[PDB]
Every structure is written in structure tokens, then in C-alpha cells.
């Protein structure tokens, strides 16, 4: 009983109203964009390597 009551008192202190209008989705979208960029670059690079290999016969 004592521990749970103390927890409830603390939770009142934090007071936890409406949800936190906090989101990390912006940085996530940006970082996914960067990963997609490096993916496109690596893809096209694999392609140009294939081409130069062919020519290099």
C-alpha cells in the first residue's frame, strides 16, 4: 500500500495531462531520404561498373 501510494503521489506531480505533442518523425523522414540517396548512388555505381567491365574485355 505504501509504495503504490507513493507512486500515485509522484504521478500526480508529473501531472501527465494531454499527450505530448512531440514527434521525431521529421529527422526520421530526412534520414530515410539520405539512406535512399546513398542507395540510389550505390545502385547507379554498380551499373557503371558493369558497363566499364563490359567495355574492358
Amino acid at each position: 500500500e505504501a509504495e503504490l501510494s507513493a507512486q500515485i503521489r509522484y504521478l500526480t506531480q508529473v501531472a501527465t495531462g494531454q499527450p505530448h505533442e512531440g514527434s521525431s518523425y521529421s529527422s526520421r523522414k530526412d534520414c530515410q531520404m539520405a539512406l535512399k540517396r546513398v542507395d540510389y548512388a550505390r545502385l547507379k555505381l554498380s551499373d557503371v561498373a558493369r558497363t566499364c567491365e563490359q567495355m574492358l574485355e
Partner: protein, 185 residues
């Protein structure tokens, strides 16, 4: 045209300030936290005829790529859950000192404000600890005025009777234990 200011005032102590900032950053926006270092002056119109008259000019100190801001708040108009009064926002260039001195004003009191700024919805919430300037004309020596800080919700809206006070009351409730906001003076 003819904007109104709605304001709620209250204080927050030092450690309670860490807690309050930590809470408000929870519900303002995802934008960022923005700091806030100004320097205010209040110039009295002697008004040989009738009555005193005041203008307050804030000059940024953090950016310096930013203009100075004139603000005149009329007498407090008188159930509205917030302090309601006129507010004219007049941004001017770095000359208004000598200009107002020529107009006929004189610097009564200068206070430097360092603190934080948040903006949820139309509303704008800020905490700032008004430092006192011991030497007339220097922003280097800054003593604390009160051991605690000051918070102000503020909304500037048209003159039309609007529901700004309702959002005011709601956002005032959602931070009730840490800080108290009510009309004053």
C-alpha cells in the same frame, strides 16, 4: 488592424523551472526550443497636460541581425478569463533611441530579459528571468531581480470578441501544479 493582447502571468522557481521547461517542451510543437535575450526600455511621455504615457522597446541581443520592436499596451480593458488590452506591434530600425528622445520621451527603467520562448497554436508562452542592470547603459553587469522566473501566456488577436480566452484557460489548466496563471494588477 487594432490587435488585442490577452495575457496570463505567474512565476516559477529555479528547480521548478527545469521541471516546467521539461514539461512545456512536451506540448508546444516539434519546431525547436528557442532562447531569448532582449533588452527593454520604457520611455515616459511627460504629458504636460493630462497623464503619463509609455512605450516599451525591446532590442534583441542574441541575433543582432534583427530589428527593434516598439509596443504600446493600453489600459487594461474591463468576466474574460485573461487580462485584455490593446497591443500595437511596431518594428523599427536601430535609431528609435535618439528618435524618441527627440520626440520628447526619456528612459525610465531598463531591464534585460533572458529566458525561453514557445509557441503552441496561436498562443505564445515564454519564461524569462528579468535581470536588473546596475549601471545605466551597459548590458554586461546583470543582477537577478527575483530568485525565481516569470511565465506569460500571450495571444495577440483581432479586436473582435474571440474564443482566445477558452484556449487560454485550457492550456492554463494543463500545467496547473507546476505553475499558476491568473490575471493580475
Amino acid at each position: 488592424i487594432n490587435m488585442m493582447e490577452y495575457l496570463l502571468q505567474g512565476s516559477v522557481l529555479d528547480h521548478s523551472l527545469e521541471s516546467l521547461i521539461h514539461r512545456l517542451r512536451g506540448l508546444c510543437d516539434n519546431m525547436e526550443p528557442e532562447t531569448f535575450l532582449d533588452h527593454e526600455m520604457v520611455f515616459l511621455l511627460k504629458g504636460q497636460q493630462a497623464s503619463p504615457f509609455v512605450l516599451r522597446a525591446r532590442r534583441s541581443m542574441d541575433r543582432a541581425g534583427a530589428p527593434w520592436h516598439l509596443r504600446y499596451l493600453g489600459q487594461p480593458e474591463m468576466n474574460r478569463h485573461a487580462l485584455v488590452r490593446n497591443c500595437v506591434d511596431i518594428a523599427t530600425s536601430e535609431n528609435l533611441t535618439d528618435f524618441l528622445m527627440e520626440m520628447g520621451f526619456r528612459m525610465d527603467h531598463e531591464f534585460v530579459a533572458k529566458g525561453h520562448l514557445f509557441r503552441k497554436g496561436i498562443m505564445k508562452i515564454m519564461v524569462y528571468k528579468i535581470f536588473r542592470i546596475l549601471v545605466p547603459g551597459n548590458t554586461d553587469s546583470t543582477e537577478a531581480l527575483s530568485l525565481s522566473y516569470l511565465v506569460e501566456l500571450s495571444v495577440v488577436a483581432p479586436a473582435g470578441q474571440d474564443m482566445v480566452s477558452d484556449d487560454m484557460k485550457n492550456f492554463a489548466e494543463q500545467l496547473k501544479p507546476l505553475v499558476h496563471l491568473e490575471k493580475i494588477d
